[model samples]
Target: MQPASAKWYDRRDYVFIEFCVEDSKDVNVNFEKSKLTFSCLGGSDNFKHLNEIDLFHCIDPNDSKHKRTDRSILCCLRKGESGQSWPRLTKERAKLNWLSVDFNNWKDWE
Candidate 1:
């Protein structure tokens, strides 16, 4: 039951990740280094869901946070270098299969 509606956005110094789920209680979030994982429990017909993300830039693991909501799970990560903008969603630009940058939310100061 992998929710196909999950998405992410970036700000000047933070990345915001959101996962669509039926309820907040059914989801669990784990963060390691610059990676994030979301696990869904008790999904439709008993299928589990999993979503993983490899951040583009280094982030302070201690500065990251997450929250659960009725419709989705939200994660906010603080960049390792404050006030920096990321040029891509993953450190390896070629790994865009599960992630895509929301250009509308990106600001190009250059």
Candidate 2:
């Protein structure tokens, strides 16, 4: 099992993450200092495997409040370290197929 196709980007104050799935339901997300837990029922094959994730940096768990759309869920995790950069989404330095960059909103730094 794998996560739904997801996109991410970092702005001045938060790490924005978006998971794309159609006909999604019961979406859930919990933030930690250095990790994230997510799950939802979505996609054509039935419930997807969003699972847990190890974040690259720390996050402000108490300040959380993510957005949900008809087709996807968007999380703008407040950063523990403000005005910082994120080299990658995951804790490890390996490439993951589900991960992509959200270049559209990330244009703030450019």
Candidate 3:
């Protein structure tokens, strides 16, 4: 119905976006040059939840993929350019409750 629990982290060549949900099914995701939209069915009610984000930079859709695990759904994205990073996942300075940064995997800003 609305946004799902999510977080993100990045490396030199990849950007990983994760949705925290167990038994999450029918995962439908869309990615473009600088945009992302996600939807899926799961949770206690099998709710059809959704989330959309405008990425800070270009991404390679063809190379992007997802991984569904015990309690998480992940988007394994290949950054359009290697060895680069952006301060925010979204283009705007958004403050979203359900979205967060995985600081544990967040190596550095330098």
Clash count list over all predictions: 1, 0, 0
lDDT against true structure, model 1: 0.69
Q: Sort the predicted structures by lDDT, highest score first.
A: 3, 2, 1
Q: Residues 1-110, candidate 1: write the lDDT tens digits.
A: 56435667777778777766664455677776777777876445655777866777778778888888666777888878776677665667565454555556655543
lDDT of each: 0.69, 0.81, 0.86
lDDT of 3 by residue, 1-110 (tens): 88888989998889999998778888888978888888988866888889998888889999999878768788988999998777888888999899999887787645
Number of colliding residue pairs in model 1: 1
Q: Which has the greatest lDDT? A: 3
Worst 10 residues of 2 by lDDT: 43-52
- Which pairs of residues collide in model 3? none
Q: Which candidate tops TM-score? A: 3
List candidate 1 stretches off by more than 4 Å: 1-4, 42-44, 95-98, 102-110
Let me know the TM-score candidate 2 reaches against the reference structure. Answer: 0.88
Error of 1 at 18 (Å): 0.9
lDDT-wise, the better of 1 and 3 is 3
True-structure RMSD for candidate 1: 2.8
Q: Is candidate 1 or candidate 2 better by TM-score?
A: 2
Full-model lDDT, candidate 3 = 0.86
